[PDB]
From Swiss-Prot:
This is Cytoplasmic dynein 1 heavy chain 1. The modification N6-acetyllysine is found at residue 72. The gene is DYNC1H1. The chain holds residues 4212 to 4347 of 4646 of the full protein. Belongs to the dynein heavy chain family. It is found in: Cytoplasm, Cytoskeleton. Cytoplasmic dynein 1 acts as a motor for the intracellular retrograde motility of vesicles and organelles along microtubules. Dynein has ATPase activity; the force-producing power stroke is thought to occur on release of ADP. Plays a role in mitotic spindle assembly and metaphase plate congression. It comes from Homo sapiens (Human).
Length: 136
């Protein structure tokens, strides 16, 4: 995360040389995507399908369309609703959106099917019973 933040800071300063506002089309999306796919986050990836999965998130989130008012961070999270992109322009506006999250997270937020957690949630629930019985 720190390396990615430095990469964002370095390349945005190169393009926005003191400009108060930078057009979304002028933001170096390719520089951010390629460095994260190859150097920052893709360095640990040793699989061609994990790299394919790592890219898929990059050309979706890191685009000029992410500055639109109708961008979808996640799709069909509950089959009906989808997570929307905040319309704010300041840090506090984005943070308040995080604090207002539904708190009903499902693996569909991550792009995975919701059934992926069914076995994991069952095992953890059974483990709780064993832990409660062990220390009774």
């Amino acid at each position: 995360l720190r390396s990615a933040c430095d990469t964002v800071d370095t390349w945005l300063d190169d393009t926005a040389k003191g400009r108060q506002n930078i057009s979304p089309d002028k933001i170096p999306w390719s520089a951010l995507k390629t460095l994260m796919a190859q150097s920052i986050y893709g360095g640990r990836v040793d699989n061609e399908f994990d790299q394919r999965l790592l890219n898929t998130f990059l050309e979706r989130l890191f685009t000029t369309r992410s500055f639109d008012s109708e961008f979808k961070l996640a799709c069909k999270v509950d089959g009906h609703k989808d997570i929307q992109m905040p319309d704010g322009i300041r840090r506090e506006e984005f943070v308040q959106w995080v604090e207002l999250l539904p708190d009903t997270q499902t693996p569909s937020w991550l792009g995975l099917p919701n059934n992926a957690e069914r076995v994991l949630l069952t095992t953890q629930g059974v483990d709780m019973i064993s832990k409660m019985l062990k220390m009774q």
